[PDB]
């Protein structure tokens, strides 16, 4: 199966020109928990923003610039490069999420209570086509700049 994992500010914002204006170590821990040793697919810009022991698949139209990871030129090649595995984790960014959302069966979302002026958004998903199977709210605290909610949705 294919899953997407993403951190969304209000209005589904996921990315900006520069680093995001927040500090959310709990979201990093959650991202690690749900990726671990599974294959990851990402776009070239996310890659520029590796883990041995797992397949790291980078989408780019151009030849790769780092032999430590696996470079592919199409969505079909990316899926093929992950092999037969229980779960493929698509970790960004916006262009890559848009292409894999119709193929995905699971979304792992972090809803962040922050308003940020961004240039990249998570794709529109119809909540009626998705079943929320897990949700967990957390307050901002000494380590996390904003409140945040972890949610897992499975496709209906
Ligand atoms: N392309 C542009 O016009 C351009 C220029 C400057 C800045 N930016 C900015 O970069 C920021 C990050 O965007 P993002 O989060 O969407 O990036 P992302 O998904 O992390 O990476 C997108 C990159 O992944 C590669 N890619 C995605 N789908 C592909 C496919 N089907 N086949 C082959 N390669 C594929 C392309 O790399 P390659 O580019 O290496 O082919 C593409 O540029 C955005 O803010 C955007 O405005 C875009
Ligand atoms: Ca960015």
- CB contact at 8 A, 110 and 10: no
2-155 under CATH 3.40.50.720, yes or no = no
17 token code pair: 């020109």
3-state helix, strand, coil in the chain (%, to 5): 25, 30, 40
What are the counts of helices (DSSP H) followed by strands (DSSP E) for the chain?
Answer: 4, 10
**100 CA → ligand 1 middle, Å:** 14
- CB contact at 8 A, 34 and 89: yes
Pocket of ligand 1 contains residue 138 by CB under 6 Å:
no
Q: Whose CA is nearest to atom 4 of ligand 1?
A: 45
Return d(Cα 9, Cα 53) in angstroms, integer. 31
**84 CA → ligand 2 middle, Å:** 31
Pocket of ligand 1 contains residue 118 by CB under 6 Å:
no
Q: Is 117 annotated as a binding residue?
A: no
Pocket of ligand 1 contains residue 100 by CB under 6 Å:
no
Name residues whose C-beta falls within 8 Å of residue 84's C-beta, 6 or more positions apart in sequence: none
Return d(Cα 133, Cα 154) in angstroms, integer. 7
Return d(Cα 145, Cα 25) in angstroms, integer. 9
Dmax (CA) of the chain:
43
Q: Residue-wise over 36-50: b if at least 16 C-beta within 10 A, else e?
A: eeebbbbbbbbbeee
């Amino acid at each position: 199966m294919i899953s997407l994992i993403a951190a969304l500010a209000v209005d589904r914002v996921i990315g900006m020109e520069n680093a995001m204006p927040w500090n959310l170590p709990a979201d990093l821990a959650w991202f690690k928990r749900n990726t671990l040793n599974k294959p990851v697919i990402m776009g070239r810009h996310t890659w520029e923003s590796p883990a041995p022991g797992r397949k790291n698949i980078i989408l780019s139209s151009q030849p790769g610039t780092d032999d430590r990871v696996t470079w592919v030129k199409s969505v079909d090649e990316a899926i093929a490069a992950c092999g037969d595995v229980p779960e493929i984790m698509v970790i960004g960014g916006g262009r890559v999420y848009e292409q894999f959302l119709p193929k995905a069966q699971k979304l792992y979302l972090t809803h962040i209570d922050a308003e940020v002026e961004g240039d990249t958004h998570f794709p529109d998903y119809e909540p009626d086509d998705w079943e929320s199977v897990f949700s967990e709210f957390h307050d901002a605290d000494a380590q996390n700049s904003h409140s945040y909610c972890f949610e897992i949705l499975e496709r209906r």
